[PDB]
Design a binder for this molecule. Sequence first.
Ligand SMILES: Nc1ncnc2c1ncn2[C@H]1C[C@H](O)[C@@H](COP(=O)(O)OP(=O)(O)OP(=O)(O)O)O1
Length: 312
Amino acid sequence: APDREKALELAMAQIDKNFGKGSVMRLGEEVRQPISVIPTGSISLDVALGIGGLPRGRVIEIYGPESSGKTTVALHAVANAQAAGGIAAFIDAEHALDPEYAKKLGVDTDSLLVSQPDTGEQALEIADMLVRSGALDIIVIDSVAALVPRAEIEGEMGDSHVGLQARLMSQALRKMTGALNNSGTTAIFINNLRETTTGGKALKFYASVRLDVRRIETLDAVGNRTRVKVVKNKVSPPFKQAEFDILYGQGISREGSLIDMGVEHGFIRKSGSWFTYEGEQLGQGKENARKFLLENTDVANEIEKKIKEKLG
Ligand SMILES: Nc1ncnc2c1ncn2[C@H]1C[C@H](O)[C@@H](COP(=O)(O)OP(=O)(O)OP(=O)(O)O)O1
C-alpha cells in the first residue's frame, strides 16, 4: 500500500498549501514560476538566488561585516528598480550613504526618497507608512542596529533594561510584511555585523531571502572581491553562493562577472595565465582580460549573451 514518492509528494503539497509555496523543497530542484524580481546588480548572485534577483514584496536581509559590499548591492538593486521606472526609498539611520557613488552605480538620487528618523520606532513607522502607499518598488533600511528604541535614545535607565529593540523589530515586521506583500515592494534591511545585532533575531524569521555578504579577496589596490551566500531562500533552493568584484569607486564589475562565469561555464577557455575567447587573445591576468572586455565592448556582449542563454 505504501509508495514513498507518491506519499511524499502529497505531503509536500499539503505542506506548501498550509504555509505557502517554498515551505519545503528539494535542493537540486529547478525553478519555473519566474516571480517578479529586482536584479541584484550581480549576475552570479542573481543566479544564486534562483530567480534572477531579489523577489518583490519580500523582506530581504543583507548581513555581513563592514566594507564587505552590502550597500553597493542594495544600491544597485535600487538603481535597477528605478530604470524599471520604480520609485525608491532609503530609511537612513547611519548617515553614511554617499549619493555621489550612488549615482555612479546608476541610481537616480534626485528622485530617491531619503528619511533620517529620530528613533527606531519612527524609522520603521515611516517605512511602513511609505510601503502601504503602494508607490514603492523598493525600500532600503540602513543598519538594523541603528534602530535603537526611543526609550533608549531618550534618557531612560539602568532599570527595565530590556530586549526592547528586538521586540521593536518584531512587531514592526509583523505588520509591515503583510503590507509589503500587497504593495509588492521589496524591503532590504542592511545588517552590519560587528541576536544578529539585536533586531536580527526577528529579521531571521521574517526574511524570505537572507544574504550573507563577506569580503574575501583584494584584487595594485583596485578594489575587492565579495562572496555572498544565500543562507535563506523561501522562493528557491537555498544555500547557493556567488562571487563578484567591486572596484574602488565602481560598483559590481560587469566584465569581471563575465570573465568569471564565462570561465566556469566554458565559453571562455582559460589556459593557465592566459584567458581566451573563441580563439581570441583576451590577455594574461583577469585584469588585462577585464580591460579587454571593457574596451572591446562587442565581445563580452556576445559572451554575456552566450552565458545568459545557457542559464536564464
Ligand atoms: N564612497 C565610496 N568611495 C569609493 N568606493 C566605495 C564607496 N562606497 C563603496 N565603495 C566600494 C569600495 C568598497 O571596497 C566596496 C565595499 O563597500 P560597501 O559596498 O560600502 O561595503 P558594505 O556594504 O559591506 O559596507 P556597509 O557596512 O556600509 O554595508 O564598495
